[PDB]
């Protein structure tokens, strides 16, 4: 947690992890069910569950950012919007939001 | 897809698809891949120009009553 804490040469620093709300943009250019060029942003704070730290730092890496949210932003927006035409996304945004 | 655009089964295809030939080559692969779209200039403006020529259908309808109104001014 935070503080200040002391640590053993042989077990060596801990991985330090941007803990807290962090802004990320998503600007997206797709379709929809009516082919239809849509220009959407998407706009996400980001934690990492502390919990999942030492595992995220295996398998993600010590940068939680860049590597796993870019494809799941991306394509979440992309397969939503596509379920909806062009007019839903503001007639029907609650839903799109949802 | 070019029309059919089911990205719903695009994704579940390509993901299936990717991780048995990735298993082919000992790599594991199992993503959310992010499936573009580009299409031509002509298949984007024949698929804008749908909606355009719609919107011009109702604008000729709200011409229409304009113009009634205009002749009841005239009359």
Do not use: M
Request: charged content about 25%.
């Amino acid at each position: 947690g935070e503080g200040t804490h002391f640590l053993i040469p042989w077990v060596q620093k801990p991985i330090i992890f941007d803990c807290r709300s962090r802004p990320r943009n998503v600007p997206v250019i797709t379709g929809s069910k009516d082919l239809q060029n849509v220009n959407i942003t998407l706009r996400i704070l980001f934690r990492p569950v502390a919990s999942q730290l030492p595992r995220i730092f295996t398998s993600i890496g010590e940068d939680y950012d860049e590597r796993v949210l870019p494809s799941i932003t991306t394509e979440i927006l992309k397969s939503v919007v596509a379920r909806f035409d062009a007019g839903e996304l503001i007639t029907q945004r609650e839903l799109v939001s949802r | 897809s070019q029309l059919i655009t089911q990205r719903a089964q695009v994704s579940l295809l390509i993901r299936r698809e990717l991780t048995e030939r990735a298993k082919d080559f000992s790599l594991i692969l199992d993503d959310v891949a992010i499936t573009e779209l580009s299409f031509s200039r002509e298949y984007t403006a024949a698929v804008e120009a749908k909606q355009v020529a719609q919107q011009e259908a109702q604008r000729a309808q709200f011409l229409v009553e304009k113009a009634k109104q205009e002749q009841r001014q005239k009359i």
